[PDB]
């Protein structure tokens, strides 16, 4: 029909830059028994530095000051001082920032950088963009947090305000997210006056006049001590409903033991890392011996059985790695007490195999409807004995805030073998009278509490992190973390006024010494 | 072997208890020894570890000039073993205390941690502990609540927080304890929902086919319509094939 129908028509690392005003307005404090706004900015910066050091040390942080007599930057823009360029956080940077922490630190700031100098925002945004461009690592996020207590710094010039507005728009277009941590101001801080055109995202209720310091300061000051790991698939296995039917799936660990960072060996004199090397040589020949020339041997009552390394690996070979599906088992037969290993999470991939997501979704829907779990043999990697596991469907759940709390997919639970179970000694069944059960029920009800998955903290890891931080920053003493795991028996005793004594009298004979 | 301790609700009530490892991963008890091919003696083969600095001359460093250290974000923080022991988090060993009681539905099995399950009974001889533990188990079962306990094998062992829940059978009853995760262990992963994915929406025929497959591949059967499920493939009663 002519020329009519034949023609138609998670990665990288996070970064952050601290922008701190150097005007005299930031230094004055309202009355005594209060901390000056610049001190609050420094405290927040230090807390963020520590939190980044612990949670994710691969991120990049930078500190830039403006409104100072001195200047320093790769472009020589006046009144701009890049105290710390974008680099991985370290104890040295925190110690350097600690210089300005005290009042003598404030005097050092005044003497070494000055204050009260005029400035233009466009210059600050230019230096920030240059700092972002300088680094070479992939940039998952780019954030600029401006610490200031001024509403409209260019209250007398419109050209400067227009330049700042256009530069803020350009940076927002480039993919830079800007936030403002407004601090104390005697009169009152309002964001709609000048910063309405600069902030990348405006909250639902932010145009009102703000009197108290920014709420985000409290969150920033809240130090977090817990290693953070980005989403990553442990393995990309191949579920096999049949020799021909196959779908690629990804395996993740939603719960993983948090071990303390591994230690290393340092040379005492110079205090630098040393290298570890191991080797094996014949006691007689005294020459380098490779694994090939060695053999594996086992002794059983004056008899030695010897096999090659390849033979030893072959011993455990049963089938290729993956999930070989079998029939479906009712969820009732999955006993709660039959727990062997932490459960894993199985999710669709759709990358290795196209069309697996729809089949996985249908299986999940019908398994939830029928309340069954897919029993399957599992082989995480080559040369590993198979293990029987059960895939129980997981229904997606979300809270009132519409934030995911239980991702959809399959929960893989390892089913113990016959030899995994252990025999137990005979115990005579003794039944308690109903009155004892009632008293203990009263105690249990009196000691009720709501349990959350993250209601407790690992005391060992927290203490280790606090000790390491104290030594790195040369703190006088390490803060003693409160052990939430302790039973806090004082409140327990207070709640159980006389229940314990009554229960003991009812159930414990007079002659008994626990 | 039984592990004896005391379940302590507070500072006044204490029940003598014994715990056994009900479930534990089974591994090979015999290791593999390395021997030379030409001569079948393990004496000839030996392992030597050599430590050297990152220098051209590769100076060897004695075992007595090495200090334990940790990384603090591109900065190295020396931390001696003696200092670690002095500042190590001390704890009272052999402790089994109840922090509180929470609804069973709150604790989900997907959060279970550790590599063992404990079964706790009363002490071997005394009957007072037996009746006390029976009363506690019955109360928990009736109220459908589970205790959040603190477990510590010994002073050296790191303390952990676990869930103890009742287990009542026709001939014996006990408390089943399984470790629970700390806030550090939890992983916050975001996965796109599949229900609302238009491109991942199976049709009615696909759902019917999946349902037919599930029905045809059932590993459980009805025992003469007597309301008693029968397991056709009881994987829990199959010995580990690796040992055989």
């Amino acid at each position: 029909s002519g020329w009519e129908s034949y023609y138609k028509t998670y990665s990288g690392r996070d970064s952050l830059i601290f922008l701190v005003d150097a005007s005299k307005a930031m230094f004055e404090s309202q009355s005594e028994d209060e901390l000056t706004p610049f001190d609050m900015s420094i405290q927040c910066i230090q807390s963020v530095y520590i939190s980044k050091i612990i949670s994710s040390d691969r991120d990049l942080l930078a500190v830039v000051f403006y409104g100072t007599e001195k200047d320093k930057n790769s472009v020589n823009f006046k009144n701009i001082y890049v105290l710390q360029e974008l680099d991985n956080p370290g104890a040295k940077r925190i110690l350097e920032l600690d210089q300005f922490k005290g009042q003598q630190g404030q005097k050092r700031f005044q003497d070494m950088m000055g204050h009260g100098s005029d400035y233009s925002l466009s210059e600050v945004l230019w230096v920030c963009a240059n700092l972002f461009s300088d680094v070479q690592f992939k940039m998952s996020h780019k954030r600029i947090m401006l610490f200031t207590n001024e509403d409209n710094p260019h209250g007398n010039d419109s050209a400067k305000a227009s330049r700042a507005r256009t530069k803020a728009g350009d940076l927002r277009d480039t993919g830079i997210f800007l936030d403002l941590m407004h601090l104390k101001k005697p009169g009152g801080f309002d964001i709609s006056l000048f910063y309405r055109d600069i902030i990348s995202i405006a909250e639902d209720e932010d145009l009102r006049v703000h009197f108290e310091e920014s709420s985000k300061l409290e969150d920033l000051l809240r130090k977090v001590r817990a290693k953070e790991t980005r989403k990553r698939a442990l393995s990309r296995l191949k579920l096999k409903l049949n020799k021909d039917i196959v779908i690629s799936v990804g395996i993740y660990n939603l719960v993983q033991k948090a071990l303390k960072p591994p230690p290393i060996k340092l040379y005492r004199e110079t205090n630098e890392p040393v290298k570890t090397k191991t080797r094996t040589f014949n006691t007689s020949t005294g020459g380098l011996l490779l694994p090939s020339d060695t053999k594996r041997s086992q002794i059983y009552g004056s008899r030695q059985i010897i096999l090659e390394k390849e033979e030893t690996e072959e011993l455990k070979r049963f089938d290729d790695p993956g999930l070989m599906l079998m029939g479906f088992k009712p969820l009732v037969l999955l006993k709660k007490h039959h727990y062997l290993r932490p459960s894993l999470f199985v999710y669709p991939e759709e990358s290795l195999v196209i069309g697996s997501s729809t089949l996985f979704s249908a299986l999940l829907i019908k398994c939830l409807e029928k309340e069954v779990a897919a029993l399957c043999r599992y082989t995480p990697r080559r040369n590993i004995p198979p293990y029987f596991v059960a895939l129980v469907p997981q229904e997606e759940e979300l809270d009132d805030q519409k934030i995911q709390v239980t991702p959809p997919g399959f929960q893989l639970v390892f089913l113990p073998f016959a030899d995994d179970k252990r025999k137990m000694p005979f115990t005579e069944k003794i039944m308690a009278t109903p009155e004892q059960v009632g008293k203990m029920k009263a105690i249990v009800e009196k000691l009720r509490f709501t349990y959350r998955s993250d209601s407790f903290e690992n005391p060992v890891l927290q203490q280790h992190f606090r000790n390491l931080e104290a030594l790195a920053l040369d703190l006088m003493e390490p803060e003693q973390a409160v052990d939430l795991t302790l039973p806090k028996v004082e409140a327990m005793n207070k709640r159980l006024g006389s229940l314990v004594d009554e229960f003991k009298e009812l159930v414990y004979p007079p002659d008994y010494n626990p | 072997i039984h592990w004896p301790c005391r379940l302590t609700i507070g500072s006044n009530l204490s029940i003598r208890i014994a715990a056994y490892k009900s479930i534990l991963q089974e591994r090979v008890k015999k290791t593999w020894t390395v021997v030379d091919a030409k001569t079948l003696k393990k004496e000839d083969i030996q392992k030597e570890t050599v430590y050297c600095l990152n220098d051209d001359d590769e100076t060897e460093v004695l075992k007595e000039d090495i200090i334990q250290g940790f990384r603090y974000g591109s900065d190295i923080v020396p931390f001696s073993k003696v200092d670690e022991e002095q500042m190590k988090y001390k704890s009272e060993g052999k402790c089994f205390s109840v922090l509180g009681f929470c609804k069973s539905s709150q604790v989900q099995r997907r959060f279970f941690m550790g590599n063992q399950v404990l079964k706790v009974f009363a002490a071997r001889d005394d009957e007072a502990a037996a009746v006390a533990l029976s009363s506690l188990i019955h109360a928990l079962d009736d109220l459908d609540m589970v205790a959040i306990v603190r477990y510590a094998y010994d002073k050296r062992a790191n303390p952990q927080v676990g869930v103890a829940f009742p287990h009542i059978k026709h001939n014996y009853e006990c408390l089943v304890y399984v470790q629970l995760p700390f806030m550090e262990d939890l992983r916050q992963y975001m996965f796109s929902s599949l229900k609302n994915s238009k491109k991942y929406a199976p049709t009615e025929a696909q759902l019917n086919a999946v349902d037919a497959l599930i029905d045809s591949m059932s590993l459980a059967k009805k025992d003469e319509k007597t309301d008693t499920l029968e397991d056709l493939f009881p994987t829990t009663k199959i010995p580990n094939p690796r040992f055989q």
Binding site: S51, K52, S55, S140, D219 | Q188
Partner: peptide
């Protein structure tokens, strides 16, 4: 996105562990 930690973007902010809090 609401409820997102300001320290590590893309991760869910979590309140400090409150330990045991007995109810009324």
């Amino acid at each position: 996105c609401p409820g997102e930690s300001l320290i590590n973007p893309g991760f869910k902010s979590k309140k400090p562990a409150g330990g045991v809090d007995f109810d009324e």
